[PDB]
Structure 1
Amino acid sequence: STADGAQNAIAVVDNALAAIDAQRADLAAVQNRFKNTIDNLTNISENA
């Protein structure tokens, strides 16, 4: 409403989006690891 909000909400959402996008980057690393792993596993399976 009056004094707190206009600035406190930004103070929240800054680190909020920071942590959310950090989790997104963690998931991105996980899935890049997964894609490299599935390529490696397919190659090893074909050689086997």
Structure 2
Amino acid sequence: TENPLQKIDAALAQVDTLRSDLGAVQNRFNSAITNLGNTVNNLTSARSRI
């Protein structure tokens, strides 16, 4: 199997897309965590206020 340059390009593209997926998952659970924290603090503020 010749033409290793395109395979190196594919490998670096794989590295880049793994980085992109890692960041996507990172911000995904960051959004989930901030949403659940907002829910928790809103619930406790409503319970203490009333």
Please say which structure displays the higher CA radius of gyration. 2
- TM-score, normalisation: structure 1: 0.72
Q: Which runs of 4+ in 1 moved over 3 A?
A: none
Q: Provide the C-alpha distance between the structure 2 equivalents of 1:27 and 1:47, rounded to a whole number of angstroms.
A: 30
The two structures, once aligned, show a CA RMSD in angstroms of 1.4
Unaligned runs of 5+ in 2: 44-50
5+ residue gaps, structure 1, are: none
How many residue pairs end up in the alignment?
A: 42
Indicate the percent of aligned positions where both proteins have the same amino acid. Answer: 45
Q: Partner amino acid for 1:36?
A: S
Does the alignment pair 1:17 with 2:30? no
